[PDB]
Design an enzyme around this catalytic site. Structure first.
Site, PDB file in Angstrom:
ATOM      1  N   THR A 155      -9.214   1.841   0.454  1.00  0.00           N
ATOM      2  CA  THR A 155     -10.261   1.392  -0.458  1.00  0.00           C
ATOM      3  C   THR A 155     -10.109   2.034  -1.832  1.00  0.00           C
ATOM      4  O   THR A 155      -9.240   2.881  -2.040  1.00  0.00           O
ATOM      5  CB  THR A 155     -11.663   1.710   0.094  1.00  0.00           C
ATOM      6  OG1 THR A 155     -11.738   1.321   1.471  1.00  0.00           O
ATOM      7  CG2 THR A 155     -12.728   0.964  -0.696  1.00  0.00           C
ATOM      8  N   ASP A 192     -12.734  -2.530  -4.461  1.00  0.00           N
ATOM      9  CA  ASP A 192     -11.762  -3.542  -4.064  1.00  0.00           C
ATOM     10  C   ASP A 192     -12.265  -4.212  -2.792  1.00  0.00           C
ATOM     11  O   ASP A 192     -13.395  -3.966  -2.368  1.00  0.00           O
ATOM     12  CB  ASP A 192     -10.378  -2.931  -3.842  1.00  0.00           C
ATOM     13  CG  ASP A 192     -10.304  -2.095  -2.579  1.00  0.00           C
ATOM     14  OD1 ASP A 192     -11.161  -1.204  -2.399  1.00  0.00           O
ATOM     15  OD2 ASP A 192      -9.382  -2.332  -1.770  1.00  0.00           O
ATOM     16  N   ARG A 200      -9.957  -4.818   0.129  1.00  0.00           N
ATOM     17  CA  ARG A 200      -8.962  -4.717   1.192  1.00  0.00           C
ATOM     18  C   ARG A 200      -9.413  -3.808   2.330  1.00  0.00           C
ATOM     19  O   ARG A 200      -9.803  -2.665   2.102  1.00  0.00           O
ATOM     20  CB  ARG A 200      -7.619  -4.231   0.646  1.00  0.00           C
ATOM     21  CG  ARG A 200      -6.590  -3.943   1.733  1.00  0.00           C
ATOM     22  CD  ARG A 200      -5.252  -3.538   1.140  1.00  0.00           C
ATOM     23  NE  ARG A 200      -4.559  -4.665   0.527  1.00  0.00           N
ATOM     24  CZ  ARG A 200      -3.419  -4.560  -0.144  1.00  0.00           C
ATOM     25  NH1 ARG A 200      -2.842  -3.374  -0.295  1.00  0.00           N
ATOM     26  NH2 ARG A 200      -2.855  -5.638  -0.669  1.00  0.00           N
ATOM     27  N   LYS A 259     -17.583  -4.169  -0.061  1.00  0.00           N
ATOM     28  CA  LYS A 259     -17.732  -2.725   0.068  1.00  0.00           C
ATOM     29  C   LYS A 259     -18.874  -2.194  -0.786  1.00  0.00           C
ATOM     30  O   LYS A 259     -19.113  -0.989  -0.830  1.00  0.00           O
ATOM     31  CB  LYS A 259     -16.430  -2.014  -0.302  1.00  0.00           C
ATOM     32  CG  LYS A 259     -15.241  -2.451   0.530  1.00  0.00           C
ATOM     33  CD  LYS A 259     -13.958  -1.811   0.036  1.00  0.00           C
ATOM     34  CE  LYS A 259     -12.763  -2.264   0.861  1.00  0.00           C
ATOM     35  NZ  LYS A 259     -11.498  -1.594   0.442  1.00  0.00           N
ATOM     36  N   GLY A 280     -13.800   4.594   3.555  1.00  0.00           N
ATOM     37  CA  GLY A 280     -13.545   5.401   4.733  1.00  0.00           C
ATOM     38  C   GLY A 280     -13.585   4.593   6.013  1.00  0.00           C
ATOM     39  O   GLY A 280     -13.030   3.496   6.085  1.00  0.00           O
ATOM     40  N   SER A 339      -8.835   5.925  -1.087  1.00  0.00           N
ATOM     41  CA  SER A 339      -7.414   6.231  -1.165  1.00  0.00           C
ATOM     42  C   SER A 339      -6.848   5.997  -2.568  1.00  0.00           C
ATOM     43  O   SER A 339      -5.838   6.591  -2.944  1.00  0.00           O
ATOM     44  CB  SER A 339      -6.637   5.401  -0.140  1.00  0.00           C
ATOM     45  OG  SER A 339      -6.775   4.015  -0.397  1.00  0.00           O
ATOM     46  N   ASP A 373      -2.261   1.897  -5.322  1.00  0.00           N
ATOM     47  CA  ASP A 373      -2.491   2.394  -3.968  1.00  0.00           C
ATOM     48  C   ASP A 373      -2.251   1.321  -2.906  1.00  0.00           C
ATOM     49  O   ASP A 373      -2.822   0.233  -2.967  1.00  0.00           O
ATOM     50  CB  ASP A 373      -3.909   2.959  -3.838  1.00  0.00           C
ATOM     51  CG  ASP A 373      -4.262   3.337  -2.409  1.00  0.00           C
ATOM     52  OD1 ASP A 373      -3.398   3.905  -1.709  1.00  0.00           O
ATOM     53  OD2 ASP A 373      -5.404   3.065  -1.986  1.00  0.00           O
ATOM     54  N   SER A 382      -5.346  -0.079  -1.177  1.00  0.00           N
ATOM     55  CA  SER A 382      -6.233  -1.005  -1.875  1.00  0.00           C
ATOM     56  C   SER A 382      -5.522  -2.317  -2.189  1.00  0.00           C
ATOM     57  O   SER A 382      -4.304  -2.346  -2.362  1.00  0.00           O
ATOM     58  CB  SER A 382      -6.763  -0.372  -3.163  1.00  0.00           C
ATOM     59  OG  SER A 382      -6.956   1.022  -3.004  1.00  0.00           O
TER      60      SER A 382
HETATM   61  C1  LIG Z   1     -10.071  -3.720  10.046  1.00  0.00           C
HETATM   62  C2  LIG Z   1     -11.392  -3.360   9.612  1.00  0.00           C
HETATM   63  C3  LIG Z   1     -12.500  -4.402  10.015  1.00  0.00           C
HETATM   64  C4  LIG Z   1     -11.790  -1.930  10.010  1.00  0.00           C
HETATM   65  C5  LIG Z   1     -10.742  -0.873  10.341  1.00  0.00           C
HETATM   66  N1  LIG Z   1     -10.910  -0.388  11.651  1.00  0.00           N
HETATM   67  C6  LIG Z   1      -9.948   0.279  12.373  1.00  0.00           C
HETATM   68  O1  LIG Z   1      -8.873   0.559  11.945  1.00  0.00           O
HETATM   69  C7  LIG Z   1     -10.308   0.731  13.764  1.00  0.00           C
HETATM   70  C8  LIG Z   1     -10.698   2.196  13.706  1.00  0.00           C
HETATM   71  C9  LIG Z   1     -11.788   2.678  14.665  1.00  0.00           C
HETATM   72  C10 LIG Z   1     -12.092   4.210  14.624  1.00  0.00           C
HETATM   73  C11 LIG Z   1     -12.333   4.908  15.808  1.00  0.00           C
HETATM   74  C12 LIG Z   1     -12.595   6.275  15.768  1.00  0.00           C
HETATM   75  C13 LIG Z   1     -12.611   6.933  14.529  1.00  0.00           C
HETATM   76  C14 LIG Z   1     -12.365   6.262  13.374  1.00  0.00           C
HETATM   77  C15 LIG Z   1     -12.100   4.861  13.418  1.00  0.00           C
HETATM   78  N2  LIG Z   1      -9.221   0.562  14.676  1.00  0.00           N
HETATM   79  C16 LIG Z   1      -9.313  -0.565  15.641  1.00  0.00           C
HETATM   80  O2  LIG Z   1     -10.278  -1.307  15.585  1.00  0.00           O
HETATM   81  C17 LIG Z   1      -8.226  -0.796  16.670  1.00  0.00           C
HETATM   82  N3  LIG Z   1      -7.248   0.307  16.833  1.00  0.00           N
HETATM   83  C18 LIG Z   1      -7.346   1.107  18.005  1.00  0.00           C
HETATM   84  C19 LIG Z   1      -6.023   1.709  18.306  1.00  0.00           C
HETATM   85  O3  LIG Z   1      -5.082   1.258  17.332  1.00  0.00           O
HETATM   86  C20 LIG Z   1      -5.395   1.536  15.976  1.00  0.00           C
HETATM   87  C21 LIG Z   1      -6.700   0.907  15.658  1.00  0.00           C
HETATM   88  C22 LIG Z   1     -11.015   0.251   9.420  1.00  0.00           C
HETATM   89  O4  LIG Z   1     -11.848   1.031   9.635  1.00  0.00           O
HETATM   90  N4  LIG Z   1     -10.249   0.322   8.225  1.00  0.00           N
HETATM   91  C23 LIG Z   1     -10.534   1.488   7.235  1.00  0.00           C
HETATM   92  C24 LIG Z   1      -9.447   2.619   7.271  1.00  0.00           C
HETATM   93  C25 LIG Z   1      -9.637   3.683   8.344  1.00  0.00           C
HETATM   94  C26 LIG Z   1      -9.925   4.989   8.025  1.00  0.00           C
HETATM   95  C27 LIG Z   1     -10.094   5.891   9.037  1.00  0.00           C
HETATM   96  C28 LIG Z   1      -9.980   5.506  10.325  1.00  0.00           C
HETATM   97  C29 LIG Z   1      -9.687   4.199  10.637  1.00  0.00           C
HETATM   98  C30 LIG Z   1      -9.517   3.309   9.638  1.00  0.00           C
HETATM   99  C31 LIG Z   1     -10.795   0.774   5.852  1.00  0.00           C
HETATM  100  O5  LIG Z   1     -10.553  -0.335   5.690  1.00  0.00           O
HETATM  101  N5  LIG Z   1     -11.348   1.592   4.787  1.00  0.00           N
HETATM  102  C32 LIG Z   1     -11.572   0.998   3.515  1.00  0.00           C
HETATM  103  C33 LIG Z   1     -12.993   1.196   3.204  1.00  0.00           C
HETATM  104  C34 LIG Z   1     -13.935   0.174   3.689  1.00  0.00           C
HETATM  105  C35 LIG Z   1     -13.523  -0.562   4.893  1.00  0.00           C
HETATM  106  C36 LIG Z   1     -15.379   0.555   3.633  1.00  0.00           C
HETATM  107  C37 LIG Z   1     -10.721   1.816   2.594  1.00  0.00           C
HETATM  108  O6  LIG Z   1     -10.866   2.911   2.779  1.00  0.00           O
HETATM  109  C38 LIG Z   1      -9.457   1.221   1.994  1.00  0.00           C
HETATM  110  C39 LIG Z   1      -9.135  -0.129   2.544  1.00  0.00           C
HETATM  111  C40 LIG Z   1      -8.306   2.013   2.606  1.00  0.00           C
HETATM  112  O7  LIG Z   1      -8.167   1.962   4.004  1.00  0.00           O
END
Ligand SMILES: CC(C)C[C@H](NC(=O)[C@H](CCc1ccccc1)NC(=O)CN1CCOCC1)C(=O)N[C@@H](Cc1ccccc1)C(=O)N[C@@H](CC(C)C)[C@@H](O)[C@H](C)CO
Lengths: 220, 238, 245, 244, 234, 233, 243, 250
Positions: free
Chosen positions: A1, A17, A19, A33, A47, A129, A166, A169
């Site tokens: 993000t 953003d 993504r 977001k 996050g 990030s 990044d 993002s």
């Molecule tokens: C795909 C979307 C609908 C959601 C995505 N979900 C996921 O990635 C979830 C994470 C669940 C979790 C469990 C315990 C502890 C922490 C997290 N994962 C899963 O659903 C499935 N998996 C299980 C095993 O394999 C890997 C993932 C997510 O959270 N993405 C985050 C990044 C992240 C950080 C830390 C842990 C997991 C993921 C994101 O987009 N964050 C953005 C902010 C927004 C969404 C508010 C940003 O930060 C930008 C895009 C950079 O990532």
């Protein structure tokens, strides 16, 4: 993000953003977001997605209850206190970095809230990030008491820096302008990225998929 | 009649009837005497028997090496309070490796027994106690009532017809402080026997003695061990 | 001033004229107790208690109605003694907690406030009955001054220059008013306290009595102590002599 | 109906046949037991509290006898009725205020404080284990935009904002005075407010106070801190009254 | 007029406890006799119907191999106490590798005396006293011993004791025939005699139960034949 | 120290009547009257907000309260009880929203609040609420008007009244009002049916009105009330 | 919770609540049971025949395990509670101990439960009595009876409920070694005893039997009518040719 | 504290629970509600007390609740207690479903609620629920089923029964026109119309005043349907055309 926030002459501009990633793969190309807290307070979330969602929703709800009982417009310090105290109570296990912006009876207020429960009240903040790039844009081209369009340009520029520099993002730029008497929730403020147009037709014509079993079921 | 059944109900005369009714329980038991010299603390208790085929009720209980008690009232409450005192003493020895000062134990008894006199559905302890103890403040005779009030005594008697014993002791207070052990036990036995019609007197079967002092841990003499005390007494008058 | 048709069986029940008779009954239990007075001079607080003797068999100093609540705070009680002792425990614990939390000796006004709140907590439910006693807290400090407070079974707490509680409360108050304690010192005051105690005492209805006395002031470095036998016998002599006029 | 009763409806907080709560009304009667009266008046740039200071004994440190209480630096109050209950409610008020500021990051509005206290009282009104408090609370303080605020809460659970009110023995007389004085529409200055309050109490009790017979709390827009008047600056108003 | 279960009479006693004592008087009468050759416990069964199996009426039970108990009054209340006693003895054996003295067991059961109440109590706590009376007969290091306990919790040692409906008369008859030197046979005989006197039904081998605990022999419940052989010499 | 009475304060009489609930209703039918009218394109709630002196500040406490952005409340009976029920209702609504991310259906809020009111007719050491509630809402296009009485029972109303003279008001609404009305018309007949018991000069500060169309719920300003109370506009 | 003493002693030494519960048992439909050599029979009287009510859903005879069955008299709901808790206990016994369950054991459990409810705070005695019947290992057929007080006994034959004294007296005067010498004869004894108090019918009587290592068997109204026909025939072939 | 306790879970000297009986008295004043079991279905029919000109009618029903896809119930007494019990019933049904992955047998659901009611009669010191319930449903064990439960926690299975105001006369009237094994849904509806006609205090009987629901088995699935006003009017009119017909023969 890559979320950011700035304070200008008449209020506050919030940027983000769109993504959302899982692993090193883009899961959502268009993710909102920038979250509704109160009609005069919005909050950008970076996050752990579900954490930012549920946290921002919960605090929004509690603030609705609060203003419902008080009959007045919610203060930003209140949302800040609620957020930081909840987040601190969970000792960082709630992955929620936040940019809280709003206009009060006391004026414009901008906070950054880290998942461990610490907050900073600053004229401009960045989280995510891609926060370093955006913060570079801010440190380079920020001046106190900007005009609305100027601040919108600055914030969108910051978010853009986050988007292109990044890998975390990507996609659109969402803005949210909040003044003492206006709320511009500009969704797709800019679409600087576009999918290339298909050069072929991979359309499969009816019949190319072999079928072993079929069952039609009428409804109403 | 409407202020009689609960310990949380004050009478319009500023009294609590349940507490007083509990006080009446002490007078229902057999009388007992306690007195101290300057070196010894002595409890003398008149044991009571249902029939001639039933052994006499225990009236003197061991608490700690330096503390013993004589009960008057509900034996169950007596056992409860006794176990409490024993526990507090054991705690004191466990923590400080020194015996618990008697006055402090009595204070704790007061604090504990005061609580149920102020809570709905609770009741006062239906038992009076005479506590004989020795510490580095000398011998001690204490008295504890169902009203959770306690008294530091030179001499005391509680229970059925204990008024006679009280009247006796009140005359020999001045003698008490200098008596040797045998004379002290004598006085205790005379006070105790004062609470009896002339048709009956003290016997080895119905008298118990508890002694604590600077030269002696708390000991209980019950049957044949009481004879050296009874044998050496006047014939009493009629 | 006398209703009782079920309206006087609980502290959770108001009377039709807006009274809580259980509390008043407890106050009457305070009234039936022997009088205890306490007076504040410019350099401290002195306590005096008419400790009636129910039997010559009891040791001297038994059933103390003067307590050490804190090293700088003394307590004089009147009424149901067991309740008074429990309240002394509560006060002690409150002072101890205050020291352990804030790091200095508890101010008297605050201690009185806390304990009073605790007392008041008992004038509200049917599950418990109001305390059957009134008490006075005395203290002295250089940064605080000389202070004397009083609490009744209802939970009311007030600051006094002179105060009395028990049988002859008014009879003692009229005698205290004659004094000019705003200028006198705790040394002179003791005699007057013993005097008022002997005056207020009824040698006819009540039997023999023992007099208890307590210092707390500049003459004791701020420590609440018992009055030495010398000064006590001196004050008693002054009192017995002043009773022949 | 019309005074009917059934069961324990006169002993605990349950409904009478006509839908009344006798214990609550009894609590209102318990407010008057103190034998005192308090008056609150809201001005244009201030808010004023005045209350009797019946000190019938020279044995009392008259500084310890007060019905005025500082809840917060900017929120003051006066309690009328049973003293111990009053002090209890004051403690609870202080707690709710401090906790409010801790949780929300801004000073609690007099409105919200009074509402909270009243909400707490309602529970006593609805639960039979406890009995309502024999006291009435009047809060005063300056609000950021709504300006001076004078609120009041009952043992019944009722709370309200007022241009002026009173509590205690001569409550009705004082209100009948105050509404008569309000209809005339004067320039509600500081001295006008203080004088109106003091004269309300005075002409309601027919006493003409000494400066040591009453106590006056106050809060101004220019000075939002809850201020208690000295005997001297009360005597100033007292002598200011005996001129016109 | 209803009051709390822990209310005191003006005389200085607990109403519920006294009422429990009153409840004992409606129970089957039992007699225990202490003898240097052993302790004996006898009790009438009070069979109310020929259809009722008399062997399912046990008012004498084994606390442990060296201790037996006789009960009178509300038996259902007694069952709990019996189990508590057994458990206490076994716990003591586990902990100390030795048998419990009869007095210790009796005291242990007696500790459940005034363990009843309403407010300030556990959800499963007793609401009322136990309407039952107990005789503990057993042999320990102090030899043969007999104890008596009533709902008040007051327990005391007896040389010979009768509890139940015919308490007084049987106690008098006991006083008339007891000297601290009887043989066990004499004790059993006397017990059965007094029992036959006080019982409304004709005393037979299926009307009562008798048990003995002696220094050399464990707790023994008398069989039909043995009962007959004692009833023989009526 | 304190705990609580664990036994019901509301029990069945030999006739079969839950007496305390009926007495609660007696308390309800004794407070200021309140009318509610459903009107095809909206709902109207109106109540007698008659204070008892010129000293009262009517712009501080309100009888017409919002639960959410689309649901409103008025009442007949005891103020404090109402206040409690309002707080609880708001909380319930927020719970529903947190779970479903969708504004709570009016019927659902009514049912839940009704359960809450039902508790106090059976739970230990408490009396029922001396309050009847009129709940207006706009969900799924259609408008909704509900009433809930102390027993915890609830009914759907086209139009109704509660409090003093609720019978006369009920017959009045039954006659001088019907469906197909617009919001304006409904407000008019609401202030009119409120006037059928207004023993005094009914000002804009003597009554309180709230409206609930498909644009949300809100309380009418004293000015709008003045325009309506001109027997026209 | 509800910490209130419900069952307490009266000045005459009675437990009124328990006695009242026993009176509630007295109002119950009459339930009798007899023990035989290789069979055991339980029968319940006034089943409140409404003819619009499903008979199955109101049976007063319930099986606790494959080994033990049970009838009751009194408050049916309380009986449901007790029965279910008894079944649960029957299973728990198998869980903690490999062996099944003895009739005496489960009887003791039920009795202990009832007593516990006679001495616990905030509760109220079960208004039922129970006739428990079984064939525990070793073959010995056993019948027990319980009481709201918590007391329990063993019987050769017994009855509880409305007019239990009458059927008790009848059974006393009719329980012989000749009677209940055969299965059908024992069942006939039960039917006769029931007819000596029931409102003269057969469609009012529910009878069930347990036999040897077999499962519990409920008797259809046809078989009951047959046994009642044989009983009405023996009452006219040995009581009509002599009177 | 001990004084204010009304002792709700205590035996009366005769050996009965007074609050339960008083609750029965409460139920006796509630709207008449009956149910009849047939060979091709089962039906509920209840009087409506919420019958006023100004009522809004926003629910499918008033006294008929759906509990399960194979089960529905009707209620008589205090409506709020009824709400509690019905909600709890739905809970129980869904728990059984979650556990065994098949619909809860009707009798099991009934017993499940009745254990709760009985629990309210035996301990807690609370007032019992002033509610009687009629249960209709289908399961793979006993097919179509009708049940009745009283506040005592007692229940029973019926082929036809009634609960509410004038319940006795309705029961005897059902006894008269009963038909063990020969009942169809149509004849049962006729019977319902008849009994509800004679028992309802306000005669003539408009479809406004009553409420009828049917549960039937159609093509593997269970169908629960509340009849519209028109259908009820048809049944009523037919009843009058059968009443004015039999009165010709005089
Ligand atoms: C795909 C979307 C609908 C959601 C995505 N979900 C996921 O990635 C979830 C994470 C669940 C979790 C469990 C315990 C502890 C922490 C997290 N994962 C899963 O659903 C499935 N998996 C299980 C095993 O394999 C890997 C993932 C997510 O959270 N993405 C985050 C990044 C992240 C950080 C830390 C842990 C997991 C993921 C994101 O987009 N964050 C953005 C902010 C927004 C969404 C508010 C940003 O930060 C930008 C895009 C950079 O990532």
């Amino acid at each position: 993000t890559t979320i950011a926030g700035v304070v200008y002459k008449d209020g506050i501009v919030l940027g983000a953003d769109t993504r959302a990633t899982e692993g090193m793969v883009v899961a959502d190309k268009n993710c909102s977001k920038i979250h509704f807290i109160s009609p005069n307070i919005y909050c950008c979330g970076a996050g752990t997605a579900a954490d930012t969602d549920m946290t921002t929703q919960l605090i929004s709800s509690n603030l609705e209850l609060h203003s419902l009982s008080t009959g007045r417009l919610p203060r930003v310090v209140t949302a800040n206190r609620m957020l930081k105290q909840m987040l601190f109570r969970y000792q960082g296990y709630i992955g929620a970095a936040l940019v809280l912006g709003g206009v009060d009876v006391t004026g414009p207020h901008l906070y950054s809230i880290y998942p461990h429960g610490s907050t900073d009240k600053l004229p401009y903040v960045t989280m995510g990030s891609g926060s370093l790039a955006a913060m570079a844009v801010f440190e380079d081209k920020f001046r106190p008491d900007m005009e609305e369009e100027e601040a919108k340009n600055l914030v969108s520029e910051a978010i853009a820096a986050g988007i292109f520099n990044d890998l975390g993002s990507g996609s659109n730029i969402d803005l949210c302008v909040i003044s003492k008497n206006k709320l511009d929730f500009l969704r797709p403020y800019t679409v600087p990225n576009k999918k290339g147009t298909r050069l072929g037709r991979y359309r499969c014509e009816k019949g190319t998929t072999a079928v072993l079993t079929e069952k039609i079921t009428p409804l109403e | 009649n409407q202020y009689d059944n609960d310990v949380t109900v004050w009478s319009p005369q500023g009294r609590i009837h349940q507490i007083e009714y509990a006080m009446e329980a002490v007078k229902q038991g057999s009388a007992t005497v306690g007195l101290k010299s300057k070196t010894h603390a002595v409890l003398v208790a008149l044991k009571r028997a249902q029939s001639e085929l039933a052994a006499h009720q225990k009236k003197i209980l061991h608490v700690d090496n330096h503390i013993g008690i004589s009960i008057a009232g509900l034996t169950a409450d007596a056992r409860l309070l006794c176990n409490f005192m024993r526990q507090e003493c054991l705690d004191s020895r466990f923590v400080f490796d020194r015996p618990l000062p008697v006055s402090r134990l009595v204070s704790l008894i007061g604090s504990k027994t005061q609580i149920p006199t102020q809570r709905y559905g609770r009741r006062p302890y239906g038992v009076g106690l005479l506590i004989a103890g020795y510490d580095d403040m000398g011998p001690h005779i204490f008295q504890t009532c169902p009203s959770a009030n306690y008294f530091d005594c030179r001499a005391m008697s509680i229970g059925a017809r204990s008024q006679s014993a009280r009247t006796y002791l009140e005359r020999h207070m001045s003698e008490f402080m200098e008596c040797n052990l045998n004379e002290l036990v004598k006085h205790g036995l005379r006070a105790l026997r004062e609470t009896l019609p002339a048709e009956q007197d003290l016997t080895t079967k119905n008298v118990s003695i508890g002694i604590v002092g600077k030269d002696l841990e708390f000991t209980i003499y019950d049957d044949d061990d009481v004879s050296p005390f009874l044998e050496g007494l006047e014939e009493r008058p009629q | 001033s006398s209703i009782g048709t079920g309206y006087d069986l609980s502290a959770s029940t108001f009377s039709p004229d807006g009274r809580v008779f259980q509390v008043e009954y407890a106050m009457k239990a305070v009234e039936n107790s022997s009088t205890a007075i306490g007076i504040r001079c410019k350099d401290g607080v002195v306590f005096g208690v008419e400790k009636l003797v129910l039997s010559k068999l009891y040791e001297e100093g038994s059933n103390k109605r003067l307590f050490n609540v804190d090293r700088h705070v003394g307590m004089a009680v009147a009424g149901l003694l067991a309740d008074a002792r429990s309240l002394a425990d509560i006060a002690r614990e409150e002072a101890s907690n205050f020291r352990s939390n804030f790091g200095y000796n508890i101010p008297l006004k605050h201690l009185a406030d806390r304990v009073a709140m605790y007392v008041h907590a008992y004038t509200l439910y049917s599950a418990v009955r109001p305390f059957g006693c009134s008490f006075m807290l005395g203290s002295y400090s250089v940064n605080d001054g000389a202070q004397l407070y009083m609490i009744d079974p209802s939970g009311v707490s007030y600051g006094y220059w002179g105060c009395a509680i028990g049988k002859a409360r008014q009879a003692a108050k009229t005698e205290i008013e004659k004094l000019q304690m705003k200028e006198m010192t705790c040394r002179d005051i003791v005699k007057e306290v013993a005097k008022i105690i002997y005056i207020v005492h009824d040698e006819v209805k009540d039997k023999a009595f023992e007099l208890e006395l307590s210092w707390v002031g500049e003459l004791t470095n701020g420590r609440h102590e018992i009055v030495p036998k010398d000064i006590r016998e001196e004050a008693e002599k002054y009192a017995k002599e002043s009773l022949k006029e | 109906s019309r005074g009917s009763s059934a069961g324990f409806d006169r002993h605990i907080t349950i409904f009478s046949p006509e839908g009344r709560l006798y214990q609550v009304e009894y609590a209102f009667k318990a407010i008057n037991q103190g034998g005192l009266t308090s008056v609150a008046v809201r001005g244009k740039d201030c808010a004023v509290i005045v209350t009797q200071k019946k000190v019938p004994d020279k044995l009392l440190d008259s500084s310890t006898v007060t019905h005025l209480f500082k809840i917060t630096e900017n929120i003051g109050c006066v309690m009328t009725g049973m003293t111990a209950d009053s002090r209890s409610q004051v403690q609870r008020a202080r707690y709710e205020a401090a906790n409010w500021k801790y949780k929300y990051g801004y000073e609690i509005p007099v409105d919200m404080l009074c509402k909270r206290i009243a909400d707490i009282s309602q529970v006593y009104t609805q639960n039979a284990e406890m009995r309502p408090l024999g006291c009435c609370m009047i809060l005063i303080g300056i609000d950021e935009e709504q300006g001076p605020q004078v609120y009041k809460c009952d043992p019944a659970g009722y709370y309200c904002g007022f241009k002026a009110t009173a509590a205690g023995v001569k409550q009705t007389e004082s209100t009948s005075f105050l509404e008569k004085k309000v209809k005339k529409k004067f320039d509600w200055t500081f001295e006008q407010t203080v004088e109106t309050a003091i004269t309300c109490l005075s002409t309601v009790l027919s006493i003409d106070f000494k400066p040591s017979e009453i106590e006056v709390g106050v809060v101004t827009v220019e000075n939002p801190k809850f201020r208690i008047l000295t005997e001297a600056e009360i005597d100033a108003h007292l002598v200011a009254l005996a001129e016109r | 007029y209803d009051r709390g279960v822990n209310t005191f009479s003006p005389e200085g006693r607990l109403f519920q406890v006294e009422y429990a004592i009153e409840a004992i008087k409606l129970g089957s009468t039992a007699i225990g006799i202490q003898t240097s050759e052993g302790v004996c416990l006898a009790v009438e069964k009070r069979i109310t119907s020929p259809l009722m199996e008399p062997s399912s009426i046990e008012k004498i039970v084994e606390i442990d191999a060296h201790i037996g108990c006789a009960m009178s009054g509300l038996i259902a209340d007694a069952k709990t106490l019996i189990d508590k006693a057994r458990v206490e003895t076994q716990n003591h054996w586990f902990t100390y590798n030795e048998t419990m003295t009869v007095e210790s067991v009796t005291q242990a059961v007696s500790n459940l005396a005034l363990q009843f109440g309403e407010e300030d109590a556990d959800p499963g706590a007793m609401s009322r006293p136990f309407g039952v009376a107990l005789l503990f007969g057993g042999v320990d290091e102090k030899g043969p011993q007999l104890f008596h306990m009533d709902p008040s919790g007051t327990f005391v040692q007896c040389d010979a004791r009768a509890i139940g409906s015919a308490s007084e008369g049987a106690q008098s008859s006991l006083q008339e025939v007891y000297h601290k030197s009887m043989t066990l046979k004499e004790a059993i005989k006397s017990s059965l005699i007094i029992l036959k006197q006080v019982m409304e039904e004709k005393l037979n081998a299926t009307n009562i139960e008798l048990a003995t605990v002696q220094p050399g022999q464990n707790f023994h419940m008398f069989t039909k034949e043995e009962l007959e052989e004692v009833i023989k010499d009526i | 120290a304190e705990r609580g009475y664990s036994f019901s304060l509301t029990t069945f009489s030999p006739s079969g009547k839950l007496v305390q609930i009926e007495y609660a209703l007696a308390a309800v039918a004794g407070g200021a009257p309140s009318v509610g009218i459903k009107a095809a394109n909206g709902v109207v709630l109106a109540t007698e907000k008659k204070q008892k002196s010129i000293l009262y500040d009517e712009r501080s406490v309100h009888k017409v309260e919002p639960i959410t952005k689309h649901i409103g409340l008025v009442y007949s009976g005891m103020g404090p009880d109402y206040r409690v029920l309002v707080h609880r209702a708001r909380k319930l609504a927020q719970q529903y929203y947190l779970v479903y991310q969708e504004p709570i259906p009016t019927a659902q809020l009514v049912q839940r609040v009704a359960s809450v009111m039902q508790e106090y007719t059976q739970s230990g050491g408490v009396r029922p609420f001396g309050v009847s509630l009129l709940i207006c809402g706009w969900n799924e296009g259609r408008p909704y008007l509900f009433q809930s009485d102390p027993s915890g029972a609830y009914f759907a109303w086209k139009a109704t009244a509660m409090g003093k003279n609720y019978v006369n008001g009920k017959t009045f609404l039954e006659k001088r009002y019907n469906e197909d009305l617009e919001l304006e018309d409904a407000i008019h007949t609401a202030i009119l049916t409120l006037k059928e018991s207004f023993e005094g000069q009914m000002t804009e500060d003597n009554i309180e009105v709230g409206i609930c169309n498909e644009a949300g719920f809100r309380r009418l300003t004293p000015t709008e009330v003045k325009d309506y109370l001109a027997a026209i506009a | 919770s509800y910490d209130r003493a419900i069952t307490v002693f009266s000045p005459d030494g009675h437990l009124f609540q328990v006695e009242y519960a026993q009176e509630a048992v007295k109002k119950g439909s009459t339930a009798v049971g007899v023990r035989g050599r290789d069979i055991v029979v339980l029968g319940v009287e006034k089943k409140s025949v409404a003819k619009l009510q499903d008979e199955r859903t109101v049976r007063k005879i319930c099986a606790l395990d494959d080994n033990v069955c049970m009838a009751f008299a009194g408050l049916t709901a309380d009986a449901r509670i007790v029965i279910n808790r008894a079944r649960v206990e029957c299973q728990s016994h198998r869980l903690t101990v490999e062996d099944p369950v003895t009739v005496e054991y489960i009887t003791r459990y039920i009795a202990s439960l009832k007593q516990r409810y006679t001495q616990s705070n905030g509760r109220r005695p079960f208004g039922i009595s129970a006739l428990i019947v079984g064939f525990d290992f070793d073959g010995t057929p056993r019948l027990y009876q319980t009481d709201p007080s918590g007391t329990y006994h063993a019987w050769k034959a017994n009855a509880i409920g409305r007019g239990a004294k009458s059927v008790r007296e009848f059974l006393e005067k009719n329980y012989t070694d000749e009677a209940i010498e055969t299965d059908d004869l024992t069942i006939k004894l039960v039917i006769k005893a029931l007819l000596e108090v029931v409102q003269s019918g057969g469609k009012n009587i529910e009878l069930a039997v347990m036999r040897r290592d077999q499962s519990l068997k409920i008797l259809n109204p046809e078989e009951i009518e047959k046994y009642v026909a044989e009983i009405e025939k023996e009452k006219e072939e040995n009581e009509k040719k002599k009177q | 504290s001990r004084r204010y306790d009304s002792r709700t879970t205590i035996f009366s000297p005769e050996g009965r629970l007074y609050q339960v009986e008083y609750a029965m008295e409460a139920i006796g004043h509630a709207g008449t509600c009956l149910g009849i079991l047939a060979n091709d279905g089962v039906l509920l029919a209840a009087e409506r007390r919420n019958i006023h000109k100004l009522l809004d009618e926003v629910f499918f029903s008033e006294k008929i609740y759906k509990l399960n896809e194979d089960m529905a119930c009707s209620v008589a007494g205090i409506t709020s207690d009824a709400n509690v019990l019905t909600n709890e019933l739905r809970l129980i049904a869904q728990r059984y479903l979650l556990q065994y992955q098949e619909p809860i047998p009707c009798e099991q659901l009934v017993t499940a609620l009745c254990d709760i009611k009985q629990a309210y009669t035996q301990f807690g010191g609370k007032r019992p629920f002033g509610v009687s319930l009629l249960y209709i449903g289908w399961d793979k064990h006993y097919g179509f089923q009708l049940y009745q439960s009283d506040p005592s926690g007692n229940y029973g299975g019926w082929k036809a029964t009634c609960i509410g105001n004038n319940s006795a006369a309705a029961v005897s009237m059902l006894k008269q026109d009963y038909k063990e094994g020969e009942m169809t849904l149509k004849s049962a509806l006729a019977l319902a119309i008849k009994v509800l006609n004679k028992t309802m205090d306000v005669s003539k009987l408009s479809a406004e005043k009553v409420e009828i629901a049917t549960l039937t088995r159609e093509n593997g699935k269970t169908v629960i349907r509340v009849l519209k006003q028109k259908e009820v009017e048809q049944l009523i009119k037919k009843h009058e055309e059968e009443e004015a017909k039999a009165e010709r023969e005089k």
